[PDB]
Design an enzyme around this catalytic site. Sequence first.
Site, PDB file in Angstrom:
ATOM      1  N   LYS C  10       0.863  -1.194   0.000  1.00  0.00           N
ATOM      2  CA  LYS C  10       0.000   0.000   0.000  1.00  0.00           C
ATOM      3  C   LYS C  10       0.885   1.226   0.000  1.00  0.00           C
ATOM      4  O   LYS C  10       1.856   1.297   0.769  1.00  0.00           O
ATOM      5  CB  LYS C  10      -0.902   0.039   1.243  1.00  0.00           C
ATOM      6  CG  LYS C  10      -2.161   0.903   1.058  1.00  0.00           C
ATOM      7  CD  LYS C  10      -3.090   0.278   0.006  1.00  0.00           C
ATOM      8  CE  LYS C  10      -4.523   0.254   0.396  1.00  0.00           C
ATOM      9  NZ  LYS C  10      -5.333  -0.578  -0.561  1.00  0.00           N
ATOM     10  N   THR C  57      -3.822  -5.559   0.516  1.00  0.00           N
ATOM     11  CA  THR C  57      -3.198  -4.251   0.707  1.00  0.00           C
ATOM     12  C   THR C  57      -4.060  -3.434   1.657  1.00  0.00           C
ATOM     13  O   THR C  57      -3.519  -2.653   2.444  1.00  0.00           O
ATOM     14  CB  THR C  57      -2.956  -3.502  -0.621  1.00  0.00           C
ATOM     15  OG1 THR C  57      -4.208  -3.157  -1.211  1.00  0.00           O
ATOM     16  CG2 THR C  57      -2.138  -4.385  -1.585  1.00  0.00           C
ATOM     17  N   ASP C  58      -5.383  -3.650   1.609  1.00  0.00           N
ATOM     18  CA  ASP C  58      -6.293  -3.029   2.578  1.00  0.00           C
ATOM     19  C   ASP C  58      -5.925  -3.370   4.030  1.00  0.00           C
ATOM     20  O   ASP C  58      -5.982  -2.513   4.916  1.00  0.00           O
ATOM     21  CB  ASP C  58      -7.739  -3.414   2.272  1.00  0.00           C
ATOM     22  CG  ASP C  58      -8.737  -2.587   3.068  1.00  0.00           C
ATOM     23  OD1 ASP C  58      -9.022  -1.441   2.661  1.00  0.00           O
ATOM     24  OD2 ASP C  58      -9.227  -3.080   4.108  1.00  0.00           O
ATOM     25  N   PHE C 159      33.183  29.140 -10.547  1.00  0.00           N
ATOM     26  CA  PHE C 159      33.329  27.974 -11.399  1.00  0.00           C
ATOM     27  C   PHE C 159      34.221  28.283 -12.584  1.00  0.00           C
ATOM     28  O   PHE C 159      33.802  28.891 -13.555  1.00  0.00           O
ATOM     29  CB  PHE C 159      31.958  27.399 -11.845  1.00  0.00           C
ATOM     30  CG  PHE C 159      32.072  26.033 -12.472  1.00  0.00           C
ATOM     31  CD1 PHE C 159      32.536  24.951 -11.722  1.00  0.00           C
ATOM     32  CD2 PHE C 159      31.753  25.824 -13.822  1.00  0.00           C
ATOM     33  CE1 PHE C 159      32.677  23.691 -12.306  1.00  0.00           C
ATOM     34  CE2 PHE C 159      31.879  24.560 -14.403  1.00  0.00           C
ATOM     35  CZ  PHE C 159      32.356  23.494 -13.648  1.00  0.00           C
ATOM     36  N   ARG C 176      29.288  33.957  -8.876  1.00  0.00           N
ATOM     37  CA  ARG C 176      27.974  33.579  -9.445  1.00  0.00           C
ATOM     38  C   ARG C 176      27.011  33.283  -8.317  1.00  0.00           C
ATOM     39  O   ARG C 176      27.400  33.128  -7.159  1.00  0.00           O
ATOM     40  CB  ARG C 176      28.098  32.363 -10.368  1.00  0.00           C
ATOM     41  CG  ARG C 176      28.441  31.087  -9.612  1.00  0.00           C
ATOM     42  CD  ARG C 176      28.575  29.903 -10.534  1.00  0.00           C
ATOM     43  NE  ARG C 176      28.819  28.688  -9.736  1.00  0.00           N
ATOM     44  CZ  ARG C 176      28.764  27.441 -10.201  1.00  0.00           C
ATOM     45  NH1 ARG C 176      28.505  27.188 -11.492  1.00  0.00           N
ATOM     46  NH2 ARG C 176      28.985  26.423  -9.368  1.00  0.00           N
ATOM     47  N   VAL C 227      29.880  22.791  -7.224  1.00  0.00           N
ATOM     48  CA  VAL C 227      28.936  22.045  -6.407  1.00  0.00           C
ATOM     49  C   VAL C 227      29.628  20.784  -5.875  1.00  0.00           C
ATOM     50  O   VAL C 227      29.479  20.439  -4.700  1.00  0.00           O
ATOM     51  CB  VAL C 227      27.670  21.695  -7.255  1.00  0.00           C
ATOM     52  CG1 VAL C 227      26.749  20.764  -6.498  1.00  0.00           C
ATOM     53  CG2 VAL C 227      26.947  23.014  -7.616  1.00  0.00           C
ATOM     54  N   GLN C 228      30.385  20.123  -6.748  1.00  0.00           N
ATOM     55  CA  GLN C 228      31.144  18.898  -6.415  1.00  0.00           C
ATOM     56  C   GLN C 228      31.990  19.099  -5.159  1.00  0.00           C
ATOM     57  O   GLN C 228      31.937  18.288  -4.217  1.00  0.00           O
ATOM     58  CB  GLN C 228      32.061  18.522  -7.574  1.00  0.00           C
ATOM     59  CG  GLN C 228      31.318  17.920  -8.788  1.00  0.00           C
ATOM     60  CD  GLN C 228      30.817  18.938  -9.809  1.00  0.00           C
ATOM     61  OE1 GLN C 228      30.556  20.097  -9.499  1.00  0.00           O
ATOM     62  NE2 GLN C 228      30.659  18.468 -11.051  1.00  0.00           N
ATOM     63  N   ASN C 254      21.698  21.988  -9.822  1.00  0.00           N
ATOM     64  CA  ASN C 254      22.283  23.300  -9.893  1.00  0.00           C
ATOM     65  C   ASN C 254      21.225  24.174 -10.591  1.00  0.00           C
ATOM     66  O   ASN C 254      21.041  24.034 -11.793  1.00  0.00           O
ATOM     67  CB  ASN C 254      23.612  23.200 -10.665  1.00  0.00           C
ATOM     68  CG  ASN C 254      24.417  24.470 -10.606  1.00  0.00           C
ATOM     69  OD1 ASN C 254      24.019  25.432  -9.943  1.00  0.00           O
ATOM     70  ND2 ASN C 254      25.562  24.496 -11.307  1.00  0.00           N
TER      71      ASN C 254
HETATM   72  O1  LIG Z   1      29.298  23.658  -9.952  1.00  0.00           O
HETATM   73  C1  LIG Z   1      29.221  23.339 -11.151  1.00  0.00           C
HETATM   74  N1  LIG Z   1      29.546  22.066 -11.467  1.00  0.00           N
HETATM   75  C2  LIG Z   1      29.532  21.590 -12.713  1.00  0.00           C
HETATM   76  O2  LIG Z   1      29.812  20.412 -13.003  1.00  0.00           O
HETATM   77  C3  LIG Z   1      29.108  22.527 -13.759  1.00  0.00           C
HETATM   78  N2  LIG Z   1      28.971  22.407 -15.116  1.00  0.00           N
HETATM   79  N3  LIG Z   1      28.526  23.684 -15.494  1.00  0.00           N
HETATM   80  N4  LIG Z   1      28.382  24.608 -14.438  1.00  0.00           N
HETATM   81  C4  LIG Z   1      28.764  23.856 -13.347  1.00  0.00           C
HETATM   82  N5  LIG Z   1      28.793  24.259 -12.070  1.00  0.00           N
HETATM   83  O1  LIG Z   2      -5.887  -6.968  -7.039  1.00  0.00           O
HETATM   84  C1  LIG Z   2      -5.688  -6.789  -5.826  1.00  0.00           C
HETATM   85  N1  LIG Z   2      -4.510  -7.225  -5.328  1.00  0.00           N
HETATM   86  C2  LIG Z   2      -4.169  -7.121  -4.044  1.00  0.00           C
HETATM   87  O2  LIG Z   2      -3.075  -7.506  -3.588  1.00  0.00           O
HETATM   88  C3  LIG Z   2      -5.145  -6.466  -3.166  1.00  0.00           C
HETATM   89  N2  LIG Z   2      -5.150  -6.184  -1.826  1.00  0.00           N
HETATM   90  N3  LIG Z   2      -6.387  -5.547  -1.651  1.00  0.00           N
HETATM   91  N4  LIG Z   2      -7.169  -5.418  -2.818  1.00  0.00           N
HETATM   92  C4  LIG Z   2      -6.365  -6.016  -3.766  1.00  0.00           C
HETATM   93  N5  LIG Z   2      -6.633  -6.147  -5.072  1.00  0.00           N
HETATM   94 XE   LIG Z   3      26.326  22.977  -2.871  1.00  0.00          XE
END
Ligand SMILES: O=c1[nH]c(=O)c2nn[nH]c2[nH]1
Ligand SMILES: O=c1[nH]c(=O)c2nn[nH]c2[nH]1
Ligand SMILES: [Xe]
Lengths: 295, 295, 295, 295
Positions: C10, C57-58, C159, C176, C227-228, C254
């Site tokens: 679920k 799942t209910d 950069f 920047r 960023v790296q 970025n």
């Molecule tokens: O911080 C950055 N990392 C990158 O790899 C990059 N490529 N373009 N600008 C960038 N700025």
């Molecule tokens: O098709 C279904 N599968 C399930 O596993 C399920 N559990 N509740 N209703 C359901 N319906």
């Molecule tokens: Xe960052």
Amino acid sequence: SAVKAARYGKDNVRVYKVHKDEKTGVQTVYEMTVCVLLEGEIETSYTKADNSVIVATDSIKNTIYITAKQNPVTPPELFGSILGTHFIEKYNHIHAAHVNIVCHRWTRMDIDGKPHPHSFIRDSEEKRNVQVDVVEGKGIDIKSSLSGLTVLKSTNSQFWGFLRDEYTTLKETWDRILSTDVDATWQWKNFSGLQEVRSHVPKFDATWATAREVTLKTFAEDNSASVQATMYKMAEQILARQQLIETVEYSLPNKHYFEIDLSWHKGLQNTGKNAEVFAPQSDPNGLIKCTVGRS
Amino acid sequence: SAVKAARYGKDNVRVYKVHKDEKTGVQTVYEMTVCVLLEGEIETSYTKADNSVIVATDSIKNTIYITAKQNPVTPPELFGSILGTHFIEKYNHIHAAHVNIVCHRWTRMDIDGKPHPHSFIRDSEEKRNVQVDVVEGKGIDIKSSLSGLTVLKSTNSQFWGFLRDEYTTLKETWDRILSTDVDATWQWKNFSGLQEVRSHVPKFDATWATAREVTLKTFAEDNSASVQATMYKMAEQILARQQLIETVEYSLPNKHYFEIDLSWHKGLQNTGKNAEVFAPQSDPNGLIKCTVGRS
Amino acid sequence: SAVKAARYGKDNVRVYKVHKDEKTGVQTVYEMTVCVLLEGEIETSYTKADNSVIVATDSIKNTIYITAKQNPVTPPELFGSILGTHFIEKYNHIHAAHVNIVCHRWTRMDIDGKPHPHSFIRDSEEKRNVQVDVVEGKGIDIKSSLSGLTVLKSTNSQFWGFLRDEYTTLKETWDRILSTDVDATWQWKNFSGLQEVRSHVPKFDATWATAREVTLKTFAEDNSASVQATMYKMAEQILARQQLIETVEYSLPNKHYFEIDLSWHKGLQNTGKNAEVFAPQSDPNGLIKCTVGRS
Amino acid sequence: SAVKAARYGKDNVRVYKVHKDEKTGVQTVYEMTVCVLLEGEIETSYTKADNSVIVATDSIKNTIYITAKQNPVTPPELFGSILGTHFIEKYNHIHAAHVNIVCHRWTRMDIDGKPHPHSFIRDSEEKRNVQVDVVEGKGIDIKSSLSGLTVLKSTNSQFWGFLRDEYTTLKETWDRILSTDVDATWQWKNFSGLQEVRSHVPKFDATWATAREVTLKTFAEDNSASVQATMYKMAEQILARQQLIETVEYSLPNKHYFEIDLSWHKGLQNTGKNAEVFAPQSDPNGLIKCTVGRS
Ligand SMILES: O=c1[nH]c(=O)c2nn[nH]c2[nH]1
Ligand SMILES: O=c1[nH]c(=O)c2nn[nH]c2[nH]1
Ligand SMILES: [Xe]
Ligand SMILES: O=c1[nH]c(=O)c2nn[nH]c2[nH]1
Ligand SMILES: O=c1[nH]c(=O)c2nn[nH]c2[nH]1
Ligand code: NA
Ligand code: NA
Ligand code: NA
Ligand code: NA
Ligand SMILES: [Xe]
Ligand SMILES: [Xe]
Ligand SMILES: [Xe]
Ligand SMILES: [Xe]
Ligand SMILES: [Xe]
Ligand SMILES: [Xe]
Ligand SMILES: [Xe]
């Protein structure tokens, strides 16, 4: 201080309904999201903590399900009018209901060239919407719309001859990409009540289909001078085909696709006549609106 | 401390390409979002501030556009393999490239029953994806997928005979709604390099189409005993139709639609055989996964 | 064909818990979204329509609520370990549980300089997460993370000195803007079972706080070479402060802010030393990852 | 057919501005998203393909950046008024400008109990907004708002005494959770022009701060009889503290948290006085609005 305006209700009520033809075995599904907001003599709930005037929003939710059980949910113009009328008739102190419906697509699947009786696909996030305002003593106002219809044409769009001043950098062009998400709304003449809405039921689906067809054909065929000019052509045609419409409104983003100059790399030619690879721009976007009515 | 793993690159690179047939006037568009991440002898950029080993992510962006200009962008399995191979061949110290491509739908419009030469519609947010891992000396690994395919069937789904204990409240059922968003991935046998990928080019579109068709037909026709059982049937059929696939993986939400008991209101009957109006549930949802391979 | 891997359960189970101190009147709230996926001897549900092996799942949903009722929900590392252990102990044929928890912020309000006893604000969409894998006979593996921590510095980022070739257009820079959304994950040494997780309970909140503090201070104070380089400094410090962590992984976009040349307009100076107004770019973005472990 | 209304412009224009104090070294950043739509004598662009009347949306974008370069961007009420006035004064045929600004939070970081000179954090997605309508000959109308302020109280909310009829299932309660996302708008008296807006500059930030403080304190301290009653108290107080405001509008979702009955499981008590674990509901939600003005 005084309450100048107030409305309250339930939003985001998801509803599904299935219709089962016992004769043919064919099933048809409808799914919508509904919002209902009420107005009337409810100021005291705000000013005096008087809850006796409040139809609980939870009850509004229950009413939507009950109404869907007992009535057709299509066309949405009719369902909205039924739902809004219910509130103004049932409660003496409620004088207006505002109903918004969004209809989601569930399109019947074709399996091996045959329509399947009970299997459906969501083909696009395009929606069909209604806004219904039911006002006691003033009838029913309906705005119908389509939204989320996303299109692109790769040529036959131009934009030249605009104002040029010291703020302008945009180059004139005789060949560009045009792409938009269509939001189109048609406003019906006021209806006197439910009986009149019922009398026009066949016109609702037909007018939606016409609005959609006119939008797609005009977009595809117009050698567009601007978004402004193409959108006006669309609106004019819808008004001509349905006399019960008073106004048509379009709201259109201009989703830009930019040329990429690659000439810095080995003289690669990718602009003007040689443009093949473009960069779609997420933002900003042009936004162009117009409301067209009768002379 | 030591660098155990590192990769870096450019994500969310939107690309559009148009092909223009001068003979017929017909134009065809492709739009994708591309991510490329590189690995290799780059630890010193992290540990010693040695930027000399860094192919700038900005340059990776430029390379994507240049590669799209000079090569076909379809099928995406081929374009991804070209793009990844470029990085490992061009840069001595780069030893792996990881390329993810999402392809967006631009479907040619039909206007008056004829395909339009340069106008397109986005019919659904369904995507076709590829993940291509190009590793120096180890060839090319390709995973192809479809995602965002949203379907519903209104009957012919069952779920009974599950484990019942003191944590169980779920009722067994012989007739329920089944709705899901399909995510299906097929993993190709390892390819030795670009020449081998090129040799199999026709199989890529054909296998995508087969995966889609098998998914839709099986969903529509299976009298489903569970999501588990229906999904296995889908995977088995894909493996049978394409010998170059090694595994098929499905990941499927179970998007629940609940019955609404309305009996508290004037004895209205809306459960079991009488169920017409349901409440779609936004959350929680079942999530069911399986990877199917060969004996 | 054969089932190579399977898991099901679920997802998107929203849970809120309140603790009420009867002595002081103070209330404390916790809100989480939980996903539980199970593995074990369940192949036959896929291959033979054998539902007898399926914990519905209910029922998994019910179990999450019951477990939250009977146990502390904080720290999430402990709650996740309790929940996962439950499934492998209760069901003979279930051999692994995979528990993902996202914790949402509800920060106590200060009203007139005093902490309020029962009122809370969502201050940012920053999350604290856990992934807990409970595998029968192999103990408990816990990955803890913070995500959605969005920061910007307006200077003291550089950069320059990167690889320049025929694909490069990027200018070197000594000043920047640097902005990112921090995703940082620390992986704990394997725990033998619940007793051992319980023995280390105080370390979980303390290590989260340390990871957050180290991230913010290093970002603010480092005259960043890339960023790296800055991200490596962060990871090194976390590993030094908590011996029970085996690896630290950072994944950092970025998020670019571009200079806008305005010189075409009345010679307005807005680049280099004169840059005041910038255009934030929604896409594309750099993506930089690294996993740092012990020598 | 005739054009009844038209407006067009640029949406989603992201702008960042930095201010650098040379004396103290302290830097302050502002980030906004701006939309500008124009109206005036532009019908012919729609009806006759006359682009000569169009100030290109691209030029509108350039103007936003230039205006931000040459003017303060704070308070946003002032910046919006400057930007809107520019268009109506510069272009004879443009008679109204509509400027929407969303301000994003960049809050100065505290590192070791000291404010950092150039490092910032996004603390929540709460926004401060303005809508400025500049209409030639009719002055400047300003609506200021805060939105996306998400709060919860775990007790001291009640809801009883509402209308009960055959559509009602909701139980009365004297102790419930109350949670909402606050959208609050205050509308200023009409200003005659830019000189008058400038004369009131200090009131804009002060009134925003007051609106925020009143909202938080009232929510925390009111033993709430309903959303309606608590929201009215908020609006009344804002109107009392700033005479230049004409109306205050609140729009508040009621985000429901449901009790979970666990009594089916070993008689576990989790309702009423014993309620500890609740299920947050994503949808539907109550929606409550009110506009409060002066007697
Ligand atoms: O911080 C950055 N990392 C990158 O790899 C990059 N490529 N373009 N600008 C960038 N700025
Ligand atoms: O098709 C279904 N599968 C399930 O596993 C399920 N559990 N509740 N209703 C359901 N319906
Ligand atoms: Xe960052
Ligand atoms: O505060 C509330 N106001 C309402 O109008 C309402 N309706 N249901 N619950 C409610 N709670
Ligand atoms: O169709 C367009 N309409 C406009 O108003 C505009 N402004 N820039 N580009 C444009 N394209
Ligand atoms: Na009435
Ligand atoms: Na290499
Ligand atoms: Na077990
Ligand atoms: Na003017
Ligand atoms: Xe519906
Ligand atoms: Xe258009
Ligand atoms: Xe592309
Ligand atoms: Xe399925
Ligand atoms: Xe919780
Ligand atoms: Xe700004
Ligand atoms: Xe409230």
